[PDB]
C-alpha cells in the first residue's frame, strides 16, 4: 500500500505522473478491487499479464561516440575533443537520469595570432618589442603547434580634432612638423598583413611600419579590436583554430562615449567597415565601442584577447580584463619571464581552463555537475576546471532532473565547453504516455453507452464533458 | 504616471540638423513659455554645418519653428602684431541650450580658434564659444573664456600647464538662479576638464563684436592639476547646481567627470570657488558614471538630492556574465553638515545596450502628491530598442524602485529618443508640469502634457 495506490489515480497517464516507480496494468482479467496503479512487483503478484504492464524506464544511451583525438594536427578539422558528441535521453515525470561527458585539451592544435599594434608617437620607445617579432613569435610557438598563422594591424586614434593636429596645413601630412622630425599622417586603424604562415612576411611588413602622432594620450585601440574581430574574411581567422588577438600599447584607451569630444555621437554598430584600402572608414563618424559590445563579438567570433601592455598601465588593463571574461594580460617590459614569450604564457594560461556551458536548456530540465580534474579528484557542484596543461583530459558527471511533464515531448539542448568547437548534443524525450493510449476506443460501447472512451482498461470521460 | 501618451505635440526641424540634441523651456518677459531647441548640424551660409537654434512657440499641434538667428561668419582681427581667427565650420552651435530669465544661451563646443604671429601660431583648436541672446530686445552677445593669444612654443616651454586650447567651452551649460552662467569644458587643461563661470549681465556689458579677445573681470575658471587621477577625466562633461552646504547665500556646483581616475568615473560637489565639498566615485570602470547629473529634492525634506547617471554600467547576470544596461544612483542629502553616504537607491536598466540613465530630468511634482519626481532616458531601450523614457515618483524614502509610467518612442529606430530631457514647467498652463523629449536622430521634439491623475 504505497503512494501509487493511495493516490487513487483515474487513468494510466495519471498513474505514471505520481512517481517514477509506479506502473499501470491494462489487463482485462483483473480482480474485483485490485488497484491498477502499483509497483511492477505488486501487479505481477496479482496475475497481471506481463504485456499489459506499462512501466517506462528512464534511460540514456549514446548515439555518436567518437574517441578523443591524440593529435590536433593534420586532418581537415576532423578533430574530436568532446566525447560523446550526441546522446539520447529518456525521462518520465519528476524522474532524473545521469550521463557523463569528457573534454580534452588536444595537443598540436592550430593557432592564429593577429598582432594589433599601437603606432602612436608614444610608441617610439616600445617598437623594440616588435623588431624581429615574426621569428621570435614562431620559435616558442613551434613547440606547441605545428600549424601557426600570424597577421598584423596598426592603430592610432580617430583622425579628427582635437585628437588630431590640424594646423598648420603641413601638420596634416606630417604631424611631427612642429619638431625636428617627420612621421606618418594620422590613421584610425589599418589592416597590414592578413593571417599567414609565412613568418618572413610578418617580419618584412613590420620593418616598413613607423609611428604617427596625435594630441591626447588615450588612443583608439578599441576601435581596432572591434574591426579585427568582425572583419573575419579580411583578418583571415580560420574556422578550426585558436584565435589570439594580441593588443599592444603603452597608454590608456578611449571608450564608448568619449567620441563626443569630437562631435561623434553615433554608437558603434559592431559592423565591419574596413574597405579594400584596408582602413577603418567609420573612424571619424562612429563612436568607440563599449566593453559589452566588444565582449559580444569576441565571444561570437571566438577570439581570445591578450593585453600585452607596458607596466605603467598593466593595472588599468588587468581591470578591463576582468570586465571582459577570458581576457589575459601580459607585462610588456624589458625584464620578465620573457617579454613576448608573454604570448606563449598567455596561450598556456588560455588553455588551462575547461568550463562547460549549457545552451537551449528547457525550462523543465535542471542540471547538476560533478567535475573530475587533476587526478580523479571529484568536485561536486562544479562545472569548470583549472590548472590544466595542453594534452590533459577531464570529465563531468551530469544529472538532468525533469520537473513535471512538459507539453513538447521532443526537445534537445547542447553542452559545449567555452571556446571549443565541438559539443555534446543531448536529445531528450519525455515519456509520460502509454502504448495502449494509441489504440483507444472513443465513444466505446463499454463506457456509459457511447459517452466515454475506453483505453488502458478503464473508462475515461470523452471530450466535451 | 499622469503624462499623456495618446495626444503628443511634435516639433520638427531640417533633415540632418540633429534638431532636438538639446532643449529647454523659455519664459519671456510676459511669462509666456516657449521651447528652445538646439540643432548642432544645421546648415550655415556656405552650405556647411555650423549648427543653429530654434525658438518654438507653444502650440498643441506643434510644427515648424522660427530660427533664433546668430552670427555664423568666421572672424579675423589683425591686432597687436597678431592675427586672431575664429572658425565656425562644424562648430556645433546648439550642442547645448539653457534659458535663464528672458535670455537664451546656445553653445558651440567645437568652434575652433587660432592665433597667428609671423610663422608661429597658437594651434587651431576647439576652444568652444557660447552665444547669448535676448529674443525680445534683439540683443546679442558672446562668451569664449578659453580663447587665448599664447603661441605654441610657450606651452611647450611651460610643460603644457594651464592649456585651455581644447576646452570646448559650452559642452555642458547651466545658469544659477542669481544669473551666473556656468560652462563645462571637458577638454580644458589638456583634457582634465575645467569650469568657466561669469555673470550673464557682465557677459553682455563687456561684449562688443569684432574684438574677439575681451576681458570679463568677474569671470572665474577652475584650476589645473598635476594629479594623474584627473587626467582625461573630462571634468565638466555634465554640470548642475544646487544647495548642498546649508548656507543659502552660497550656490554649489555639481560636476560630472565620467572618465575620472582611469575611467572609474566620478562626480564632485563644489562651492562657487571650486573647492570640493564631496566626491562620488564610480562603481564600475567604463560605465561612464557622471555622464549626466540631476539635482532635485525627491523626498520632500527641503534638501536637494543628487542623481547620477552611468549609461554604460554592466549588470551582473547568471553564469558570471555582464549585460550593459545602464544605471542611475540616488544620493539623499543628510540633515545638516554631513557627507553624502552610499547611494540610497540603485535604478538599473533592463534592455541591453539601452543606455538607461543617459539623461535624467527633474519633473517637479508631476502627480501633485507632495514629492518631486524624475524622468530617466534609455535612448536605445524598450523591447524595440527605439528609445524609452521612464518616470519615477518621489516618496518620503526617496524614489520608487519601479517606474510609474513608461513612454515608448513615437519615432523610428535610431531617433535617440530621450538623449535630451526637460521638465518641471507648465507649458500649457493647466496646473501640471510637462515634459519635452528630444530625438535628434529623428530631428524632432515630442512634448508630453501632464493631465489630472486618473487613478
Amino acid at each position: 500500500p504505497n503512494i501509487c495506490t493511495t493516490r487513487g489515480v483515474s487513468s494510466c497517464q495519471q498513474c505514471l505522473a505520481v512517481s517514477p516507480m509506479c506502473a499501470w496494468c491494462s489487463d482485462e482479467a483483473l480482480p474485483l478491487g485490485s488497484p491498477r496503479c502499483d509497483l511492477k512487483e505488486n501487479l505481477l503478484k496479482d496475475n497481471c499479464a506481463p504485456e499489459s504492464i506499462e512501466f517506462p524506464v528512464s534511460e540514456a544511451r549514446v548515439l555518436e561516440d567518437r574517441p578523443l583525438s591524440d593529435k590536433g594536427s593534420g586532418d581537415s578539422s576532423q578533430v574530436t575533443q568532446v566525447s560523446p558528441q550526441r546522446i539520447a535521453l529518456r525521462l518520465r515525470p519528476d524522474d532524473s537520469k545521469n550521463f557523463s561527458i569528457q573534454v580534452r585539451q588536444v595537443e598540436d592544435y592550430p593557432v592564429d595570432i593577429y598582432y594589433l599594434m599601437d603606432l602612436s608617437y608614444s610608441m617610439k620607445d616600445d617598437l623594440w618589442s616588435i623588431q624581429n617579432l615574426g621569428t621570435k613569435l614562431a620559435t616558442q610557438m613551434r613547440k606547441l603547434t605545428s600549424n601557426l598563422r600570424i597577421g598584423f594591424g596598426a592603430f592610432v586614434d580617430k583622425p579628427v580634432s582635437p585628437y588630431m593636429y590640424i594646423s598648420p596645413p603641413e601638420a596634416l601630412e606630417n604631424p611631427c612638423y612642429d619638431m625636428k622630425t617627420t612621421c606618418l599622417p594620422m590613421f584610425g586603424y589599418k589592416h597590414v598583413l592578413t593571417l599567414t604562415d609565412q613568418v618572413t612576411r610578418f617580419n618584412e611588413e613590420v620593418k616598413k611600419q613607423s609611428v604617427s602622432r596625435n594630441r591626447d594620450a588615450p588612443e583608439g585601440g578599441f576601435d581596432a579590436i572591434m574591426q579585427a574581430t568582425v572583419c573575419d574574411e579580411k583578418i583571415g581567422w580560420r574556422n578550426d583554430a585558436s584565435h589570439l588577438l594580441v593588443f599592444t600599447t603603452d597608454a590608456k584607451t578611449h571608450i564608448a562615449l568619449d567620441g563626443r569630444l569630437a562631435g561623434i555621437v553615433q554608437p558603434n554598430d559592431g559592423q565591419c567597415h574596413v574597405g579594400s584600402d584596408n582602413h577603418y572608414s567609420a573612424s571619424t563618424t562612429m563612436d568607440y565601442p563599449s566593453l559589452g559590445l566588444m565582449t559580444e563579438k569576441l565571444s561570437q567570433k571566438n577570439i581570445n584577447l591578450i593585453f600585452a601592455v607596458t607596466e605603467n598601465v598593466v593595472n588599468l588593463y588587468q581591470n578591463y580584463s576582468e570586465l571582459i571574461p577570458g581576457t589575459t594580460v601580459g607585462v610588456l617590459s624589458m625584464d620578465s619571464s620573457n617579454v613576448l614569450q608573454l604570448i606563449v604564457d598567455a596561450y598556456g594560461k588560455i588553455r588551462s581552463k575547461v568550463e562547460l556551458e549549457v545552451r537551449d536548456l528547457p525550462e523543465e530540465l535542471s542540471l547538476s555537475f560533478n567535475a573530475t580534474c587533476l587526478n580523479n579528484e571529484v568536485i561536486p557542484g562544479l562545472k569548470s576546471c583549472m590548472g590544466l596543461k595542453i594534452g590533459d583530459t577531464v570529465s563531468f558527471s551530469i544529472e538532468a532532473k525533469v520537473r513535471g511533464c512538459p507539453q513538447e515531448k521532443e526537445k534537445s539542448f547542447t553542452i559545449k565547453p567555452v571556446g571549443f568547437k565541438d559539443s555534446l548534443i543531448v536529445q531528450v524525450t519525455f515519456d509520460c504516455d502509454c502504448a495502449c493510449q494509441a489504440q483507444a476506443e472513443p465513444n466505446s460501447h463499454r463506457c456509459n453507452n457511447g459517452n466515454g472512451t475506453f483505453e488502458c482498461g478503464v473508462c475515461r470521460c470523452g471530450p466535451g464533458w | 504616471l499622469n503624462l499623456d501618451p495618446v495626444q503628443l505635440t511634435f516639433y520638427a526641424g531640417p533633415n540632418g540638423s540633429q534638431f532636438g540634441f538639446s532643449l529647454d523651456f523659455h519664459k519671456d518677459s510676459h511669462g509666456r513659455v516657449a521651447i528652445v531647441v538646439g540643432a548642432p548640424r544645421t546648415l550655415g551660409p556656405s552650405q556647411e554645418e555650423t549648427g543653429g537654434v530654434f525658438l518654438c512657440p507653444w502650440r498643441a499641434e506643434g510644427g515648424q519653428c522660427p530660427s533664433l538667428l546668430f552670427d555664423l561668419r568666421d572672424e579675423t582681427r589683425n591686432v597687436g602684431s597678431q592675427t586672431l581667427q575664429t572658425f565656425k565650420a562644424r562648430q556645433g552651435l546648439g550642442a547645448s541650450v539653457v534659458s535663464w530669465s528672458d535670455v537664451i544661451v546656445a553653445c558651440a563646443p567645437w568652434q575652433h580658434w587660432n592665433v597667428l604671429e609671423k610663422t608661429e601660431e597658437a594651434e587651431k583648436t576647439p576652444v568652444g564659444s557660447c552665444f547669448l541672446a535676448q529674443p525680445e530686445s534683439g540683443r546679442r552677445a558672446e562668451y569664449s573664456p578659453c580663447r587665448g593669444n599664447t603661441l605654441s612654443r610657450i606651452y611647450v616651454e611651460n610643460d603644457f600647464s594651464w592649456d585651455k586650447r581644447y576646452c570646448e567651452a559650452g559642452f555642458s551649460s547651466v545658469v544659477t538662479q542669481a544669473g551666473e552662467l556656468v560652462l563645462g569644458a571637458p577638454g580644458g587643461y589638456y583634457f582634465l576638464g575645467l569650469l568657466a563661470q561669469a555673470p550673464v549681465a557682465d557677459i553682455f556689458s563687456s561684449y562688443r563684436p569684432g574684438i574677439l579677445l575681451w576681458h570679463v573681470s568677474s569671470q572665474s575658471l577652475s584650476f589645473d592639476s598635476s594629479n594623474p587621477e584627473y587626467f582625461d577625466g573630462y571634468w565638466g562633461y555634465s554640470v548642475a547646481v544646487g544647495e548642498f552646504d546649508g548656507d543659502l547665500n552660497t550656490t554649489e556646483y555639481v560636476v560630472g567627470a565620467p572618465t575620472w581616475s582611469w575611467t572609474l568615473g566620478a562626480v564632485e560637489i563644489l562651492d562657487s570657488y571650486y573647492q570640493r565639498l564631496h566626491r562620488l566615485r564610480g562603481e564600475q570602470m567604463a560605465s561612464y558614471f557622471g555622464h549626466s547629473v540631476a539635482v532635485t529634492d525627491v523626498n520632500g525634506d527641503g534638501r536637494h538630492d543628487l542623481l547620477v547617471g552611468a549609461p554604460l554600467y554592466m549588470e551582473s547576470r547568471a553564469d558570471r556574465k555582464l549585460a550593459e544596461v545602464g544605471r542611475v544612483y540616488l544620493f539623499l542629502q543628510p540633515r545638516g553638515p554631513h557627507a553624502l553616504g552610499a547611494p540610497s537607491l540603485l535604478l538599473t536598466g533592463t534592455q541591453l545596450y539601452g543606455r538607461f540613465g543617459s539623461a535624467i530630468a527633474p519633473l517637479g511634482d508631476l502627480d501633485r502628491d507632495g514629492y518631486n519626481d524624475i524622468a530617466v532616458a534609455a535612448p536605445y531601450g524598450g523591447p524595440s530598442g527605439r528609445g524609452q523614457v521612464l518616470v519615477f515618483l518621489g516618496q518620503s524614502e526617496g524614489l520608487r524602485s519601479r517606474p510609474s509610467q513608461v513612454l515608448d518612442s513615437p519615432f523610428p529606430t535610431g531617433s535617440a529618443f530621450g538623449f535630451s530631457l526637460r521638465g518641471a514647467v507648465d507649458i500649457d498652463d493647466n496646473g501640471y508640469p510637462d515634459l519635452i523629449v528630444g530625438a535628434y536622430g529623428a530631428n524632432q521634439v515630442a512634448v508630453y502634457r501632464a493631465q489630472p491623475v486618473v487613478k
Binding site: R213 | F160, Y190
Partner: peptide, 6 residues
C-alpha cells in the same frame, strides 16, 4: 606630458 609622447 599628458599627451601622446614617450
Amino acid at each position: 606630458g599628458r599627451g601622446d609622447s614617450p
